[model samples]
Target: MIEPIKRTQVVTQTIHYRYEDGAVAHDDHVVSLIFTQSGKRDLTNGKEIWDSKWSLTQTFEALPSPVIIGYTADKPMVGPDEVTVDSKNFLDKQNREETVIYSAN
Candidate 1:
């Protein structure tokens, strides 16, 4: 019998910035995203041909940066692709992070 498997993961986007010498800002800009994958496997061995290709539950989209009147962003947005991974062979709800930076205009 083939075994059905599923896993989930998290992605974090950290927002950073550049500002005028005395201009100030507040708040930690971090956002969390959730995604998942699923597959079926028959473990005759560690490397078997019965394993199904894992499918991503959702497609990840680029996080567009907020437009600021006098600031420019180094990278306007984060990833716009599906996230793929493992959590000790199960959904551990683990997380990874990305950095987005904006520079002074």
Candidate 2:
């Protein structure tokens, strides 16, 4: 049996800013991090693994259920963790609910 993950981990977030005509705007971003006890392998050992980096749009795309489920061979098969955001508060808030729910199970 897999042990319950009880701690929060920080996911590195990289944002790309596009400069057009001396104006800087949000271009795109990627998330790279490790999830606690989210790996399919070594379930009883609670081993941590690096989840695939996801683009800003790809993060949201992998949230819906039935369409995109838990990592590794799951539908939409994005990765094994939620998109962690430290910049956009809204995105973090929105994604937190789903990630927490999944983590609890």
Candidate 3:
């Protein structure tokens, strides 16, 4: 007789982004991950009041300098700028509830 399946495993992972300025940012929760032959992408959505996404195309073996290539979106849609980042092209929105901090390191 064939042996039955042994056990199941559950794993939880958290993603982090560290800036060159010695400041570190992390995702409270990650929803999905998509990978291509030469590109890697990640996004977090439907879990919070806001959603975010980023993409990167790598060509080297070692990791390249991390880039802040993502955007955030609120409930209502506006212009392409609304679909993209805020004034500085770093974060889409920031204020009392949420904010993005950048340091010079």
- Pick the winner on TM-score between candidates 1 and 2: 1
Model 3 Cα lDDT, one tens digit per residue, 1-105: 222221111222233344444456534322222222122223333221211243322121222223344522221121111122211223222211122333333
Task: Please give, for residues 22-54, the per-residue lDDT of candidate 2 as tens digits.
Answer: 333333345545433233344866674333442
Off by over 4 Å in 2: 1-5, 37-105
Give one digit per residue, the lDDT tens place, for model 1 in 1-105: 556665556766555543444343324457666666555566664432322454344445676766677676666775665545443343544344544444567
Instruction: Check candidate 3 and list the clashing pairs.
Output: none
> Which pairs, if any, clash in model 1?
none
Winner of 1 and 3 under TM-score: 1
Q: TM-score winner between 2 and 3, please give it.
A: 2
Among these predictions, the greatest TM-score belongs to 1
lDDT of every model, 2 decimals: 0.53, 0.34, 0.26
- Regions of model 1 farther than 4 Å from truth: 1-53, 86-94
Q: Could you estimate the TM-score for every candidate?
A: 0.46, 0.23, 0.20
The total number of steric clashes, by the backbone 3 Å criterion, in model 2 comes to: 0
Q: How many clashing pairs per prediction, in order?
A: 0, 0, 0
